[PDB]
């Protein structure tokens, strides 16, 4: 149960033994992935429609 408050030190102390973490051959890459993760499709389609709506809105609002 990791969130923005969670640190990579506890992830290293509780997820290191997992073979999935062993697939990442770089510790810096693992830390960057943890930071990215700390900060099902049709609704995603509606999300892209919303994205188009907001980009059109910002463009027209600036003009």
């Amino acid at each position: 149960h990791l969130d923005s408050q969670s640190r990579w030190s506890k992830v290293k102390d509780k997820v290191e033994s997992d073979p999935r973490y062993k697939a990442v051959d770089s510790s810096s890459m693992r830390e960057d992935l943890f930071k990215q993760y700390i900060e099902e499709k049709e609704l995603e389609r509606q999300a892209r429609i919303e994205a188009s709506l907001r980009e059109r809105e910002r463009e027209v609002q600036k003009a």
Binding site: R48, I49, S52, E55, R56, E57, V60, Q61
Partner: protein, 49 residues
Amino acid sequence: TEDPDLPAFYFDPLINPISHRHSVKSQEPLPDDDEEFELPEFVEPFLKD
């Protein structure tokens, strides 16, 4: 529209917004001991599908 992701019908930001509410419908206040209008069972908008 230069974006197919936009719906074919949508309130464009270029179109100016429409103003606030006004409704003059002064129907008779019904003394409500009655059953009102009801459509038939197989009645639906023309192109619901």
